[PDB]
C-alpha cells in the first residue's frame, strides 16, 4: 500500500475530532468509553485502559492524531469478519474488477423486482460514492455497509 492521500488524511482528521469531544487534540480512555457506550458496548474499565496502552507505547496517557492513524492502521489488517464482506462485495461485483458499478447493483435490484429509476439508484450510490466516479470502490463498500 502507498502512503495515505491528503484527502484520506483529511478524512481521518475529521474522524479524529469525532472521537475527540474536547477538541484538545487527544483521545483518552474516557472518550474511548464514551464512544463504546454510545455503540451499546459495555467492556470493563481495564479493557478500555488496555485498548489505550495498545497504542500508547509512549506512555503519555492519550491517543494523539498520529496514534489515531496507527489505530486505523491496525484495522487495515485482515480480520475474520472480512470474509463475509468480501463475499458480499463479489455478489455485486459480477465481473470482479474491484468496483461495483451502478449498473451491476441495478442488475441485482432488477432481479429482485425493485422498480427504481436510474436516478433513484444514483441517490443510493451517492451515499457511498466519496470520489464521485459513479461506482462503489472496495473501501467505499465498507462505508456503505457501515450505514443503512
Ligand atoms: Ca480529548
Ligand atoms: Ca500517546
Ligand atoms: Ca464490477
Ligand atoms: Ca466511487
From Swiss-Prot:
The modification Phosphoserine is found at residues 81, 101. The modification N6-methyllysine is found at residue 115. SMART domains: EFh (SM00054). Residues 76-148 are annotated as: Necessary and sufficient for interaction with PCP4. There is a cross-link at residue 21 (Glycyl lysine isopeptide (Lys-Gly) (interchain with G-Cter in SUMO2)). It is found in: Cytoplasm, Cytoskeleton, Spindle; Cytoplasm, Cytoskeleton, Spindle pole; Cytoplasm, Cytoskeleton, Microtubule organizing center, Centrosome; Cell projection, Cilium, Flagellum. This is Calmodulin-1. Keywords: Acetylation, Calcium, Cell projection, Cilium, Cytoplasm, Cytoskeleton, Disease variant, Flagellum, Host-virus interaction, Isopeptide bond, Long QT syndrome, Metal-binding, Methylation, Phosphoprotein, Repeat, Ubl conjugation. The keyword RNA-binding does not apply. One of its GO terms (molecular function) is calcium channel regulator activity. The modification N6,N6,N6-trimethyllysine is found at residue 115. GO terms for cellular component: calcium channel complex; calyx of Held; catalytic complex; centrosome; cytoplasm; cytosol; extracellular region; myelin sheath. The keyword Transcription does not apply. Pfam families: EF-hand_7 (PF13499). Changing residue 89 to L: In LQT14; significantly decreased of KCNN2 calcium-activated potassium channel activity; not changed KCNN2 expression; not changed KCNN2 location at membrane; decreased thermal stability in presence of calcium ions; decreased interaction with RYR2. Homotetramer. Interacts with MYO1C, MYO5A and RRAD. Interacts with MYO10. Interacts with CEP97, CCP110, TTN/titin and SRY. Interacts with USP6; the interaction is calcium dependent. Interacts with CDK5RAP2. Interacts with SCN5A. Interacts with RYR1. Interacts with FCHO1. Interacts with MIP in a 1:2 stoichiometry; the interaction with the cytoplasmic domains from two MIP subunits promotes MIP water channel closure. Interacts with ORAI1; this may play a role in the regulation of ORAI1-mediated calcium transport. Interacts with IQCF1. Interacts with SYT7. (Microbial infection) Interacts with Rubella virus protease/methyltransferase p150. This protein has four functional calcium-binding sites. InterPro entries: CALM/Myosin/TropC-like (IPR050230), EF-hand-dom_pair (IPR011992), EF_Hand_1_Ca_BS (IPR018247), EF_hand_dom (IPR002048). The N-terminal and C-terminal lobes of CALM bind to the C-terminus of KCNQ1 in a clamp-like conformation. Binding of CALM C-terminus to KCNQ1 is calcium-independent but is essential for assembly of the structure. Binding of CALM N-terminus to KCNQ1 is calcium-dependent and regulates electrophysiological activity of the channel. The C-lobe interacts with KCNN4 channels in a calcium-independent manner, whereas the N-lobe interacts with the S4-S5 linker of KCNN4 in a calcium-dependent manner playing a role as calcium sensor and gating the channel. (Microbial infection) Inactivated by S.flexneri OspC1 and OspC3 proteins, which specifically bind the apo-form of calmodulin, thereby preventing calcium-binding and activity. The modification N6-acetyllysine is found at residues 21, 94. Belongs to the calmodulin family. There is a cross-link at residue 21 (Glycyl lysine isopeptide (Lys-Gly) (interchain with G-Cter in ubiquitin)). Ubiquitination results in a strongly decreased activity. Phosphorylation results in a decreased activity.
Amino acid at each position: 500500500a502507498d502512503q495515505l492521500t491528503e484527502e484520506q488524511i483529511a478524512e481521518f482528521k475529521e474522524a479524529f475530532s469525532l472521537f475527540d469531544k474536547d477538541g484538545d487534540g487527544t483521545i483518552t480512555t474516557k472518550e474511548l468509553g464514551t464512544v463504546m457506550r454510545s455503540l451499546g458496548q459495555n467492556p470493563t474499565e481495564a479493557e478500555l485502559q488496555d485498548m489505550i496502552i495498545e497504542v500508547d507505547a509512549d506512555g503519555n496517557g492519550t491517543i494523539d492524531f498520529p496514534e489515531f492513524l496507527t489505530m486505523m492502521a491496525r484495522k487495515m489488517k485482515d480480520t475474520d469478519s472480512e470474509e463475509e464482506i468480501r463475499e458480499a462485495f463479489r455478489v455485486f461485483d459480477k465481473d470482479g474488477n474491484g468496483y461495483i458499478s451502478a449498473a451491476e447493483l441495478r442488475h441485482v435490484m432488477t432481479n429482485l423486482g425493485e422498480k427504481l429509476t436510474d436516478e433513484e439508484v444514483d441517490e443510493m450510490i451517492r451515499e457511498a460514492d466519496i470520489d464521485g466516479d459513479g461506482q462503489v470502490n472496495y473501501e467505499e463498500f465498507v462505508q456503505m455497509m457501515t450505514a443503512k
